[PDB]
Design an enzyme around this catalytic site. Structure first.
Site, PDB file in Angstrom:
ATOM      1  N   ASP A  43      29.631  33.505  41.379  1.00 29.57           N
ATOM      2  CA  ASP A  43      30.900  34.022  40.266  1.00 29.57           C
ATOM      3  C   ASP A  43      31.757  33.354  39.345  1.00 29.57           C
ATOM      4  OD1 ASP A  43      32.890  33.665  42.120  1.00 29.57           O
ATOM      5  OD2 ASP A  43      34.350  33.771  40.973  1.00 29.57           O
TER       6      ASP A  43
HETATM    7  C1  LIG Z   1      48.621  25.413  49.410  1.00 28.98           C
HETATM    8  C2  LIG Z   1      47.790  27.064  48.624  1.00 28.98           C
HETATM    9  C3  LIG Z   1      48.878  27.866  47.708  1.00 28.98           C
HETATM   10  C4  LIG Z   1      48.176  28.743  47.428  1.00 28.98           C
HETATM   11  C5  LIG Z   1      48.719  29.433  46.275  1.00 28.98           C
HETATM   12  C6  LIG Z   1      48.287  30.962  45.522  1.00 28.98           C
HETATM   13  C7  LIG Z   1      49.064  30.731  44.143  1.00 28.98           C
HETATM   14  C8  LIG Z   1      48.457  32.720  44.041  1.00 28.98           C
HETATM   15  C9  LIG Z   1      48.229  32.546  42.190  1.00 28.98           C
HETATM   16  C10 LIG Z   1      48.068  34.163  41.439  1.00 28.98           C
HETATM   17  C11 LIG Z   1      46.874  33.894  40.189  1.00 28.98           C
HETATM   18  C12 LIG Z   1      47.195  35.590  40.126  1.00 28.98           C
HETATM   19  O1  LIG Z   1      46.354  36.306  40.958  1.00 28.98           O
HETATM   20  S1  LIG Z   1      45.852  35.706  38.696  1.00 28.98           S
HETATM   21  C13 LIG Z   1      45.169  37.431  38.545  1.00 28.98           C
HETATM   22  C14 LIG Z   1      44.027  37.332  38.745  1.00 28.98           C
HETATM   23  N1  LIG Z   1      43.441  38.826  38.592  1.00 28.98           N
HETATM   24  C15 LIG Z   1      42.461  39.377  37.246  1.00 28.98           C
HETATM   25  O2  LIG Z   1      42.208  38.691  36.996  1.00 28.98           O
HETATM   26  C16 LIG Z   1      41.791  41.016  37.081  1.00 28.98           C
HETATM   27  C17 LIG Z   1      39.977  40.882  36.353  1.00 28.98           C
HETATM   28  N2  LIG Z   1      39.285  40.284  37.687  1.00 28.98           N
HETATM   29  C18 LIG Z   1      38.522  39.417  37.404  1.00 28.98           C
HETATM   30  O3  LIG Z   1      38.074  39.775  36.055  1.00 28.98           O
HETATM   31  C19 LIG Z   1      37.255  39.042  38.104  1.00 28.98           C
HETATM   32  O4  LIG Z   1      37.160  39.849  39.271  1.00 28.98           O
HETATM   33  C20 LIG Z   1      37.913  37.496  38.254  1.00 28.98           C
HETATM   34  C21 LIG Z   1      37.747  37.188  40.261  1.00 28.98           C
HETATM   35  C22 LIG Z   1      39.096  37.046  37.542  1.00 28.98           C
HETATM   36  C23 LIG Z   1      36.934  36.624  38.609  1.00 28.98           C
HETATM   37  O5  LIG Z   1      36.583  36.210  36.821  1.00 28.98           O
HETATM   38  P1  LIG Z   1      34.780  36.443  36.443  1.00 28.98           P
HETATM   39  O6  LIG Z   1      34.161  37.182  36.381  1.00 28.98           O
HETATM   40  O7  LIG Z   1      34.671  35.606  35.402  1.00 28.98           O
HETATM   41  O8  LIG Z   1      34.115  34.932  37.227  1.00 28.98           O
END
Ligand SMILES: CCCCCCCCCCCC(=O)SCCNC(=O)CCNC(=O)[C@H](O)C(C)(C)COP(=O)(O)O
Ligand SMILES: CCCCCCCCCCCCCCCCCC(=O)OC[C@H](COP(=O)([O-])OCC(O)COP(=O)([O-])OC[C@@H](COC(=O)CCCCCCCCCCCCCCCCC)OC(=O)CCCCCCCCCCCCCCCCC)OC(=O)CCCCCCCCCCCCCCCCC
Ligand SMILES: CCCCCCCCCCCCCCCCCC(=O)OC[C@H](COP(=O)([O-])OCC(O)COP(=O)([O-])OC[C@@H](COC(=O)CCCCCCCCCCCCCCCCC)OC(=O)CCCCCCCCCCCCCCCCC)OC(=O)CCCCCCCCCCCCCCCCC
Ligand SMILES: CCCCCCCCCCCCCCCCCC(=O)OC[C@H](COP(=O)([O-])OCC(O)COP(=O)([O-])OC[C@@H](COC(=O)CCCCCCCCCCCCCCCCC)OC(=O)CCCCCCCCCCCCCCCCC)OC(=O)CCCCCCCCCCCCCCCCC
Ligand SMILES: CCCCCCCCCCCCCCCCCC(=O)OC[C@H](COP(=O)([O-])OCC(O)COP(=O)([O-])OC[C@@H](COC(=O)CCCCCCCCCCCCCCCCC)OC(=O)CCCCCCCCCCCCCCCCC)OC(=O)CCCCCCCCCCCCCCCCC
Ligand SMILES: CCCCCCCCCCCCCCCCCC(=O)OC[C@H](COP(=O)([O-])OCC(O)COP(=O)([O-])OC[C@@H](COC(=O)CCCCCCCCCCCCCCCCC)OC(=O)CCCCCCCCCCCCCCCCC)OC(=O)CCCCCCCCCCCCCCCCC
Ligand SMILES: CCCCCCCCCCCCCCCCC[C@@H](O)O[C@H](CO[C@H](O)CCCCCCCCCCCCCCC)COP(=O)(O)OCC[N+](C)(C)C
Ligand SMILES: CCCCCCCCCCCCCCCCC[C@@H](O)O[C@H](CO[C@H](O)CCCCCCCCCCCCCCC)COP(=O)(O)OCC[N+](C)(C)C
Lengths: 88, 140, 175, 122, 347, 115, 54, 49, 98
Positions: A43
């Site tokens: 992906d």
């Molecule tokens: C040490 C550990 C630390 C942990 C820290 C964690 C930090 C958390 C950060 C949270 C930020 C977010 O969630 S950011 C919000 C993310 N949500 C979206 O993007 C909605 C739409 N989803 C999609 O388009 C695809 O399923 C996608 C998965 C993007 C793949 O993209 P591609 O199709 O282009 O490959």
């Protein structure tokens, strides 16, 4: 003296070595022209990780644009050749 | 230092070729060690193993040049029964030059060295015979 | 050979020199120089130079303090090096110690000449003067003669110090 | 080595000892003084050339000062040089006189008694 | 930097040199060297331009190491004889230490490495000072202790200096490094004759100083620090390039110019001491200096290089500040050979 | 000899106090306890990072001023000489030059800390 | 019918850092026109300190 | 004429010119007198005159 | 010569070798310079005390003074270099070549 005259074969070898170093790809399967999504079932985030690995390997910043298209090893080699100005 | 020079010079020219060759080998090895030290100082070898290799290569080349020069010069002075002749030194000088070419693996270097070292060796013999002074003590 | 006090002090002097010459972090180099300064003060005191030894120890302590302050600002090196934290520093330290020991051994049991002259040991007590006179200190009198005999020395030293202030302020200006 | 720095009776920074007055002064028409004046004139011409002025005729007061300074310095320089050479000769003659065994007078043979080898050219 | 501070620092430099040259006590000579270095460090940094900081740091490190060696030689000499007067250095180990320290101060090979770097790092005026006034004190000390100098060590260092200056100058397109290598070669020529005759050393020093002053003032007049910048001077001041070519010919030792007088006077002296091979090697080695002077003469005066359009603007303006002693310097550095016997005034 | 004994005694007493301090009580050292103290929160960077000195020029001047006191300390003995006028002139000259250097540094803003 | 004089191709031989370029030395660059190198904007880090809560 | 007045112009700096000529004349007179005294002293020392 | 004299001379030689062998820090080399000055002070003082050269007793003090002028000089340069590079490493002093 400075870095040697890197060639296209060197770029291809380094790119394939990096790709075979990825866990989510079986080494013997991938070819130079294999698409990342269709053939390998990756992906967008895996492609982003691969591009970051390329940036580490070759040491130059690839923006978010001009990275959404490098979709097989072959276009990666083309991008590196264009950026580094190598032709043979 | 000067001990090596007197060790070589004390042996009469066309006699005891083994000891003369040994003394010349020691002098050449000392020169090679000095060159190796300066080359390591001014041009770092980026590793200990490569530095040891360079030092050994330089020292062996110089020691081989000295040994070959001394052996051939003494043998020439012996078979010809003509000591105190710069020709022996020239022949010895040529051998060293040829050896240098062999060590560096070049005909051009070898040919140039044979002519130049031979001439220098002959001039040193002439200076020994006539008492030429390189570092002249002040007198007037 | 008598109480080995002067020899022990000189050996500690050399050891401190090896310590700061191995070039660990300048903190430890300053520590080694401070140890050497105190030990050299002791050496000079053992020969009747009370003022000179105290003077050089006092000067060095002040100088080292400035060096420590400057080290914390410009030579910090996130992982500072001790004598056993690096093969180069440890090798230099061990080489210095071994050379000092070898020289002492060669000059102690036998009488060998290293560069200039030779030594048999005998303790430094041998070369003393036996002089029995004085209601003053010869060292203090010689140092105090600077203001009556050494007018030229005072002039050049004062001019040099004033010029040094001007010079440091010119160098650190920048622009 | 310095040969006459430690000569006895030498005054440190005199440049012209009293005994030098016993020597004939250089004539004002001395060719060395004329060369000194010529050097001054050349300096004046080069000064005109660098300053981008008419080289031959730009400053006559300046050229005159150049020539005069060169001649003035050269006169005393020649006096000191002559004095030093006279001192060298005086010391050499005195030393020869005082060491007769080191400079023995040798009776000279005539060419009728000396046998020189003949080398033909052929 | 304030003009008064600059004047006082220059006075301090000359005062250190004078203290070295008028002292009979080793401690006062060492103090003069210390004062000279202390006042000299800020002169090299008059224009900040961090290359000057690098040059000053390198110069300080070299000179301070030499000063430490000098003090150790003094102390060893005092130890083996309770003497403070500057004389023939009763101990030989101390004599070797002092010879090496003074060679480091002068920049003789193989202690020559700092000279090209420091000269390139500082401005032209600072380079003039460093290559003319800085040579007096170590040479004055060497002349006083010449009767005890080991001829072998000094002559080895002199030959090394001549060879290394000649070889190093060949690869240079920067004018300041060319001047530095010329200085090294002339230093070697100076110290070659020192054990035999100090008057010849003084004569060579004076001739070299006047030629160096002429060259540096000419390079200041036409603000060129590279070969290609100096190749533009013919299109602005042809006279400057002509005089530069004549001075360059003189520095190569060509008769009947002034620069021939020292070498001619040195070789002769060395021949009276039964030294034949040494003067021959030095004379043949000076041809390298001649070659890289001739290359500069080719670039600047004997041919005309292409110029630039903006040079036309420069045609409308004159050099404002003038060096008064430049004409005398040029004349003394070229047309002086007929007055050679005047050298007897130097002893 | 007596001063050496005094120094040895003082150092021995201090070292013994350290030994009792480290060997008498019960030690429970864990990683949280031995962590560096920065008021309850973890440090961001290292304590071995460069720390700017704003009084660096005063620090350099302190060296020369410290050698000046070494020059001035033999004055009690110098006051016993017959050439009192010369000694007084030289002492006053040294102090005047020290005061002039201080004045020069003061007027050219040498005593102001860097911002 | 004209005397040869140096051109740009001839003059460029003297514009490098050294007279004889060498594999290692060819990477040397000539000094800046004024003796002023670009200011090395070194990131001098500030100390970050916690003041409180304790 | 010229745009800038060129203060150094048709009226030469007479103080400088006078100083230069005076220095040259004083030097020449001093040299002549010095040569005369030198000749007299030399003849006096050598018993010539 | 007694053992103390050669110990002081050995300390001087060690400090000179330390100066001539740079690692990275300029401050370390400056410390070696100060150490050489200290060894010189001790050696000269020992010689002067042993021979009862009374006037020369002022000589080591003077030797100290010009030591400080050398330290204060060097430290000054160490500031400027630092201000250019944020580091006192000697590898950064390579703008000028031979
Ligand atoms: C040490 C550990 C630390 C942990 C820290 C964690 C930090 C958390 C950060 C949270 C930020 C977010 O969630 S950011 C919000 C993310 N949500 C979206 O993007 C909605 C739409 N989803 C999609 O388009 C695809 O399923 C996608 C998965 C993007 C793949 O993209 P591609 O199709 O282009 O490959
Ligand atoms: C009769 C007595 C004995 C004879 C003595 C006279 C002969 C002296 C020989 C001098 C040799 C040096 C130069 C020539 C070779 C080039 C050097 C080199 O590295 O290439 C090696 C070359 C191939 O190596 P390479 O890796 O391919 O080189 C790559 C590049 O080409 C080059 O690589 P690079 O470009 O990177 O160069 C590395 C670097 C490294 O540069 C060097 O190599 C330094 C060498 C200079 C030292 C001189 C040694 C002489 C000592 C004699 C003492 C005698 C004691 C007994 O070069 C420099 O930077 C030099 C710059 C100038 C700085 C000068 C500083 C040196 C100090 C001055 C001399 C020291 C004198 C002593 C102290 C003086 C104090 C007053 O060939 C060799 O391997 C041979 C090496 C040595 C052979 C010497 C032959 C002598 C034989 C003795 C015969 C005796 C017979 C008995 C008779 C009785
Ligand atoms: C009275 C006046 C006389 C005064 C003197 C008398 C002295 C008496 C007492 C002496 C006792 C010394 C006390 C302390 C001295 C301080 C030493 C010091 O600070 O070291 C700094 C210096 C630099 O330290 P660093 O930059 O932090 O470490 C980087 C690595 O070393 C390098 O990293 P890498 O892995 O990239 O390189 C490998 C390594 C490997 O080094 C080598 O490649 C040389 C191997 C040659 C084999 C022979 O280094 C190099 O390749 C660069 C060249 C440096 C080699 C050492 C130069 C010695 C002189 C040159 C002659 C060499 C021998 C040639 C043959 C001559 C006859 C034996 O350390 C060294 O150069 C090596 C260790 C020195 C220890 C031996 C001291 C004795
Ligand atoms: C105004 C005055 C006029 C004078 C000025 C003009 C005249 C003077 C200048 C002209 C002569 C100067 C040239 C000298 C040699 C230069 C060589 C060179 O440049 O190397 C770079 C050059 C580059 O090589 P590279 O690129 O590094 O490697 C690839 C190879 O090129 C390709 O590799 P390759 O496989 O093709 O060849 C390598 C190999 C394979 O060789 C070949 O392929 C073909 C064979 C070549 C050599 C055959 C020589 C044997 C027969 C000749 C016998 C004498 C001639 C007849 C006399 C009749 C008497 C009535 O060659 C060898 O193994 C030969 C090694 C040594 C054998 C020859 C040495 C004999 C010593 C003579 C003793 C004389 C004592 C006195 C006698 C008194 C009575 C007369 O090397 C060569 O290609 C030439 C190699 C052959 C050199 C020997 C030929 C010269 C013979 C006479 C020498 C005497 C003249 C100098 C006098 C002072 C010296 C002590
Ligand atoms: C043992 C020997 C014995 C005799 C010694 C002879 C040696 C020469 C004499 C001594 C040295 C002379 C130095 C002073 C002159 C320098 C001034 C100058 O630059 O000349 C410009 C000037 C012309 O400028 P202008 O007339 O004002 O208007 C035209 C513009 O200036 C237009 O000017 P511009 O700047 O626009 O023109 C550009 C030009 C401007 O470039 C130059 O002007 C070159 C200047 C020469 C450099 C001088 C270097 C220092 C002297 C060293 C000489 C070495 C001698 C050793 C042998 C080697 C030869 C090099 O640049 C170029 O064209 C580049 C061409 C590249 C050629 C490279 C050759 C240059 C060096 C050769 C020097 C040869 C001697 C110079 C001859 C005099 C001139 O020349 C002269 O008129 C003066 C020449 C002599 C004056 C004669 C006055 C005497 C009157 C008669 C008295 C009668 C005597 C007896 C009385 C009783 C009779 C009844
Ligand atoms: C064997 C017999 C032969 C012996 C041979 C002797 C050696 C031969 C020569 C040696 C090599 C000469 C090298 C000269 C170095 C020149 C460096 C230089 O200044 O810049 C280059 C300079 C730069 O040119 P530029 O780019 O146009 O100028 C731009 C400015 O630099 C832009 O900078 P600015 O904006 O800051 O402008 C300031 C400007 C403007 O200046 C002013 O505004 C003046 C304001 C006054 C300020 C008030 C200061 C008073 C307070 C300070 C007190 C300090 C006391 C120190 C004493 C401490 C005692 C412990 O001042 C300067 O530029 C430099 C001032 C020079 C002052 C010189 C004072 C001499 C000191 C003597 C000390 C000795 C005392 C006795 C020692 C006793 C022992 C302890 O170019 C030249 O000067 C041309 C070269 C001329 C050199 C002379 C030629 C040879 C000499 C011939 C004369 C006769 C000699 C024989 C006489 C024998 C006895 C009668
Ligand atoms: C390029 C030609 C050289 C140019 C040099 C500069 C020219 C300007 C002249 C310099 C003026 C200063 C000298 C005149 C003032 C009086 C000098 C006097 O006070 O000092 C005497 C010294 O007088 C000078 O030595 C004489 C200066 C003369 C310089 C000219 C000689 C040039 C060499 C010949 C080349 C021809 C050039 C001639 C001019 C065109 C004391 O001698 P002494 O203290 O006991 O010896 C010191 C050296 N010792 C101890 C080591 C022996
Ligand atoms: C005021 C200044 C002057 C004071 C003068 C007196 C100086 C006193 C010395 C200072 C030390 C005081 C420490 C007091 C407690 C002793 C600690 C230690 O020695 O005991 C144990 C030593 O035992 C070791 O475990 C090993 C014992 C045996 C192995 C080596 C010793 C071999 C000696 C032979 C013994 C056999 C019989 C000998 C008869 C003479 C270590 O236990 P440890 O938990 O770590 O430390 C914490 C101690 N706690 C528990 C009290 C908190």
């Amino acid at each position: 003296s400075d870095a040697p005259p890197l060639t296209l074969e060197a770029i291809k070898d380094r790119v394939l070595y990096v790709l075979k170093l990825y866990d989510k790809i079986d080494p013997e399967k991938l070819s130079v022209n294999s698409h990342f999504m269709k053939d390998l079932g990756l992906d967008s985030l895996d492609q982003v990780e691969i591009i970051m690995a390329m940036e580490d390997e070759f040491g130059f910043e690839i923006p978010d644009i001009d990275a959404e298209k490098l979709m097989c090893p072959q276009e990666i080699v083309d991008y590196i050749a264009d950026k580094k100005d190598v032709y043979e | 230092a000067k001990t090596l020079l007197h060790k070589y010079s004390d042996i009469p020219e066309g006699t005891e070729c083994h000891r003369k060759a040994y003394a010349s080998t020691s002098i050449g090895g000392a020169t090679g060690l000095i060159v190796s030290a300066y080359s390591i100082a001014l041009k770092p070898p980026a590793s200990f193993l490569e530095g040891v290799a360079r030092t050994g290569r330089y020292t062996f080349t110089s020691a081989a040049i000295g040994a070959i020069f001394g052996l051939t010069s003494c043998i020439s002075a012996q078979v010809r029964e003509k000591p105190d002749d710069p020709l022996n030194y020239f022949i010895g000088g040529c051998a060293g030059g040829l050896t240098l070419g062999a060590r560096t693996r070049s005909y051009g270097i070898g040919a140039a060295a044979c002519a130049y070292m031979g001439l220098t060796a002959a001039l040193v013999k002439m200076g020994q015979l006539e008492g030429w002074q390189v570092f002249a003590e002040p007198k007037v | 050979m008598t109480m080995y006090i002067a020899f022990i002090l000189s050996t500690i002097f050399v050891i401190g020199f090896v310590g700061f010459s191995s070039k660990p972090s300048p903190i430890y180099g300053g520590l080694g120089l401070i140890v050497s300064g105190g030990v050299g003060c002791g050496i000079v005191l053992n020969f009747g130079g009370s003022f000179l030894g105290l003077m050089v120890f006092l000067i060095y302590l002040g100088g080292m303090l400035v060096v420590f302050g400057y080290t914390t600002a410009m030579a910090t090196e996130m992982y500072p090096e001790v004598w056993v934290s690096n093969k180069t520093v440890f090798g230099a330290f061990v080489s210095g110690l071994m050379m000092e020991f070898c020289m002492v051994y060669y000059a102690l049991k036998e009488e060998e000449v290293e560069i200039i002259f030779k030594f048999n040991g005998l303790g430094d007590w041998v070369i003393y003067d036996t002089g029995d006179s004085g209601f003053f200190s010869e060292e203090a009198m010689g140092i105090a003669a600077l203001y009556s005999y050494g007018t030229w020395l005072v002039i050049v030293t004062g001019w040099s110090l004033l010029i040094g202030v001007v010079v440091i302020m010119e160098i650190t200006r920048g622009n | 080595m310095t040969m006459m720095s430690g000569r006895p009776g030498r005054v440190p920074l005199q440049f012209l000892p009293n005994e030098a007055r016993s020597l004939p002064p250089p004539k004002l028409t001395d060719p060395r003084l004329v060369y000194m004046g010529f050097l001054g004139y050349c300096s004046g011409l080069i000064d005109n050339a660098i300053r981008r002025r008419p080289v031959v005729s730009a400053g006559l007061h300046r050229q005159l000062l150049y020539v005069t300074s060169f001649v003035f310095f050269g006169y005393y320089l020649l006096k000191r040089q002559d004095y030093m050479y006279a001192l060298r000769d005086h010391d050499m003659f005195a030393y020869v006189k005082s060491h007769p065994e080191d400079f023995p007078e040798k009776d000279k043979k005539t060419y009728g008694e000396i046998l020189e080898e003949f080398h033909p050219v052929r | 930097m304030n003009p008064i501070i600059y004047t006082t620092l220059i006075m301090t430099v000359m005062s250190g040199t004078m203290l070295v040259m008028i002292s009979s006590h080793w401690l006062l000579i060492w103090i003069g060297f210390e004062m000279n270095l202390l006042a000299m460090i800020p002169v090299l940094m008059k224009n900040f331009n961090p290359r000057a900081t690098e040059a000053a740091t390198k110069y300080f490190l070299t000179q301070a190491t030499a000063s430490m060696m000098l003090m150790m030689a003094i102390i060893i000499n005092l130890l083996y004889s309770g003497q403070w007067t500057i004389t023939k250095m009763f101990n030989p180990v101390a004599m070797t230490m002092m010879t090496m320290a003074l060679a480091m101060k002068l920049g003789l090979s193989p202690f020559h490495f700092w000279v090209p770097e420091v000269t390139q790092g500082i401005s032209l005026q600072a380079g003039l000072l460093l290559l003319t006034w800085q040579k007096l004190a170590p040479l004055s000390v060497l002349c006083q202790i010449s009767q005890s100098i080991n001829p072998n060590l000094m002559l080895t260092m002199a030959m090394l200096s001549i060879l290394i200056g000649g070889w190093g100058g060949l690869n240079q397109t920067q004018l300041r490094k060319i001047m530095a290598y010329s200085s090294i070669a002339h230093m070697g020529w100076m110290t070659a004759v020192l054990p035999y005759n100090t008057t010849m050393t003084i004569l060579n020093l004076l001739i070299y100083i006047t030629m160096t002053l002429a060259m540096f003032m000419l390079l200041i007049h036409s603000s060129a620090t590279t070969t290609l910048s100096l190749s533009h001077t013919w299109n602005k001041m042809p006279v400057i390039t002509s005089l530069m070519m004549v001075t360059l010919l003189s520095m190569g030792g060509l008769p009947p110019l002034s620069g021939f007088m020292p070498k001619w006077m040195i070789i002769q002296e060395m021949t009276k001491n039964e030294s034949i091979i040494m003067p021959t090697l030095m004379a043949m080695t000076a041809l390298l200096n001649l070659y890289f002077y001739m290359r500069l003469a080719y670039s600047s005066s004997l041919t005309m290089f292409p110029s630039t359009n903006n040079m036309k603007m420069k045609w409308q303006f004159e050099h404002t500040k003038q060096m008064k002693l430049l004409p005398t310097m040029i004349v003394l550095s070229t047309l002086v050979l007929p007055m050679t016997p005047a050298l007897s005034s130097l002893n | 000899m007596n001063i050496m004994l005094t120094l040895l005694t003082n150092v021995t007493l201090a070292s013994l106090l350290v030994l009792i301090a480290f060997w008498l009580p019960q030690l429970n050292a864990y990683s949280e306890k031995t962590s560096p103290y920065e008021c309850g929160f973890d440090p961001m960077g290292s304590a071995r990072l460069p720390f700017s000195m704003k009084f660096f020029l005063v620090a350099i001047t302190f060296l020369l001023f410290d050698l000046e006191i070494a020059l001035l300390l033999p004055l009690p003995w110098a006051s016993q000489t017959n050439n009192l006028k010369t000694m007084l002139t030289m002492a006053l000259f040294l102090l005047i030059l020290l005061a002039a250097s201080l004045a020069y540094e003061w007027t050219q803003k040498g005593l102001e800390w860097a911002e | 019918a004209r005397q040869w004089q140096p051109d740009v191709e001839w003059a460029e031989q003297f514009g490098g850092a050294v007279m004889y370029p060498t594999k290692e030395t060819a990477h040397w660059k000539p000094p800046p026109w004024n003796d002023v190198d670009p200011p090395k904007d070194t990131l001098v880090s500030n100390l970050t300190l916690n003041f409180g809560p304790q | 004429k010229f745009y800038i007045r060129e203060p150094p112009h048709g009226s030469p700096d007479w103080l400088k010119v006078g100083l230069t000529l005076g220095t040259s004349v004083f030097l020449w007179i001093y040299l002549i007198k010095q040569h005369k005294e030198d000749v007299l002293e030399y003849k006096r020392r050598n018993g010539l005159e | 010569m007694p053992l103390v004299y050669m110990n002081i001379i050995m300390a001087f030689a060690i400090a000179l070798a330390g100066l001539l062998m740079y690692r990275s820090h300029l401050m370390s080399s400056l410390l070696c310079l100060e150490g050489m000055m200290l060894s010189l002070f001790i050696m000269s003082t020992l010689i002067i005390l042993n021979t009862h050269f009374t006037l020369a007793n002022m000589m080591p003090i003077i030797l100290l003074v010009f030591a400080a002028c050398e330290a204060a000089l060097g430290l000054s340069l160490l500031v400027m270099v630092s201000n250019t590079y944020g580091t006192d490493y000697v590898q950064n002093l390579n703008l000028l070549q031979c």
